[PDB]
C-alpha cells in the first residue's frame, strides 16, 4: 500500500497487500515472518534501494536475485541468480536490502 521510502525496500503480498520492508543495510531473519513467508509478492524498492531475495531460507547458496523499482511476480519467475541459474523469486523466503 504505502510506497517504499527512498532508503527502504519492500515486498508486498499479492493476496493481502500487506508490506514487509527493511531499511537499506538490513536483512531478514533466517526466514521471513510467518505472516508473509512463501506468499507471492511484488517488489516495491525505494529510489536508492535494491532488494535481494532468495527462494530459500537464509539468503543461501547464492540463490539470490536482484530487484529495483516496482516488479510484478510474473516477471520474477525466471530471474538470473548469483548462482548462475534462472530461479523463481515470486514466493521468497528471505530478503536483504542494500543501496542501489
Amino acid at each position: 500500500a504505502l510506497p517504499a521510502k527512498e532508503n527502504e525496500g519492500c515486498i508486498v503480498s499479492v493476496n493481502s497487500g500487506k508490506r514487509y520492508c527493511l531499511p537499506v543495510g538490513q536483512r531478514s531473519g533466517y526466514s521471513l515472518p510467518d505472516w508473509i513467508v512463501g506468499q507471492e509478492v511484488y517488489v516495491d524498492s525505494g529510489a536508492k534501494a535494491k532488494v535481494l531475495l532468495s527462494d530459500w531460507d537464509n539468503l543461501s547458496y547464492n540463490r539470490i536475485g536482484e530487484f529495483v523499482g516496482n516488479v510484478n511476480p510474473a516477471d520474477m519467475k525466471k530471474v538470473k541468480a548469483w548462482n548462475g541459474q534462472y530461479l523463481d523469486f515470486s514466493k521468497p523466503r528471505s530478503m536483504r536490502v542494500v543501496y542501489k
Binding site: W56, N58, L59, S60, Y61
Partner: peptide, 10 residues
Amino acid sequence: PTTSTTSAPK
C-alpha cells in the same frame, strides 16, 4: 565458499 547455508529440519 563463504556463502550462507541452511539446516535440514530438526
